[PDB]
Amino acid sequence: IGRSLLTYGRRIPLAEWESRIAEVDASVVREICSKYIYDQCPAVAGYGPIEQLPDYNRIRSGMFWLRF
């Protein structure tokens, strides 16, 4: 209740969440994942024995496919 009234201005009932969930389909997932993930620059953090953590260019090039 508290978090919702601060963030949304209103309590969202479980029924509305269910109606929102029911609309997703594979096409929606494809679209929105592409809208936020595909060919984007990431933020990376590492701590430990991280010699083998790939170079930043190698990580950036992993955000897209050449066969697409």
Binding site: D55, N57, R58, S61
Partner: protein, 54 residues
């Protein structure tokens, strides 16, 4: 890692070498050339001035 850093670096080097090679081939082909090798061979006479390839 070698890729991508030195891959693109060596490609740049190759582009430069090709520029030089083309200019030598087309714009000034006779720069290093020797006239005495445009005379066919004569087993009886050595020319007065002898000079190998540079």
């Amino acid at each position: 890692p070698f890729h991508p850093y030195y891959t693109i670096k060596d490609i740049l080097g190759l582009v430069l070498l090709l520029f030089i090679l083309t200019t030598l081939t087309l714009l000034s082909p006779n720069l290093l050339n020797d006239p005495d090798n445009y005379i066919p061979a004569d087993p009886l006479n050595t020319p007065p001035h002898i000079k190998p390839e540079w």
